[PDB]
Amino acid sequence: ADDIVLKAENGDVKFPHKAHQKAVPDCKKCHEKGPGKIEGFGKEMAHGKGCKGCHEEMKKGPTKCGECHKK
Numbered sequence: 001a002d003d004i005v006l007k008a009e010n011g012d013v014k015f016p017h018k019a020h021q022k023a024v025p026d027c028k029k030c031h032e033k034g035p036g037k038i039e040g041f042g043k044e045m046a047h048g049k050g051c052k053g054c055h056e057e058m059k060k061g062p063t064k065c066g067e068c069h070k071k
């Protein structure tokens with residue numbers, strides 16, 4: 001399947017799966033969550049543990065605006 005882009009007004013956000021599968025061997029960080037995670041995602045989650053927050057905790061991955069968002 002293909003990567004997805006989140007259409008943030010300020011600039012597209014690419015989500016590259018290959019890098020994540022390799023770097024986050026604990027698949028259950030994202031997969032087999034109970035219901036509600038598709039409806040639940042948004043800016044708050046993205047800027048918290050949904051994206052940026054995991055990058056901070058794991059000490060790797062983009063944490064600056066322009067590293068995630070790119071027109």
Ligand code: HEC
Binds near residue numbers: 015016017027030031
């Ligand atoms: C969140 C940061 C994730 C982690 C960590 C892992 N996966 Fe993932 N997976 C995630 C998303 C948002 C998607 C769909 C969008 C996309 O870019 O693909 C997926 C998709 C998969 C798939 C389908 C892939 C394909 O057919 O190309 C598989 C088989 C899958 N995910 C498995 C998987 C495993 C085994 C992981 C740990 C090693 C893993 N994923 C990490 C989100 C996230």
Ligand code: HEC
Binds near residue numbers: 019023030046050
């Ligand atoms: C942990 C549970 C993560 C979540 C949730 C998200 N990301 Fe992530 N990401 C994570 C790690 C440990 C890394 C480092 C991978 C590496 O090999 O450097 C990343 C990396 C990225 C990248 C850069 C990939 C690259 O090839 O350099 C991007 C663009 C990225 N992450 C974006 C991203 C987004 C948009 C997420 C939410 C939708 C997200 N990540 C979640 C760990 C985790």
Ligand code: HEC
Binds near residue numbers: 041055064065068
């Ligand atoms: C990845 C790790 C990100 C970093 C670092 C920053 N942003 Fe972000 N942001 C990210 C995603 C995946 C999303 C989309 C949420 C969704 O609904 O799917 C966003 C969202 C925004 C928004 C709202 C966009 C909209 O509603 O259309 C804004 C205004 C925004 N982001 C700005 C922004 C700034 C200024 C940042 C640095 C301080 C920043 N983001 C970091 C992913 C990530």
Ligand SMILES: C[C@H](CCC(=O)O)[C@H]1CC[C@H]2[C@@H]3CC[C@@H]4C[C@H](O)CC[C@]4(C)[C@H]3C[C@H](O)[C@]12C
Binds near residue numbers: 045
């Ligand atoms: C559930 C995990 C981990 C974050 C958490 O613990 O909540 C998060 C990490 C990235 C999130 C995905 C990002 C791309 C998509 C954003 C959509 O708007 C909702 C569905 C998707 C596919 C999201 C589903 C889910 O919200 C995920 C996989």
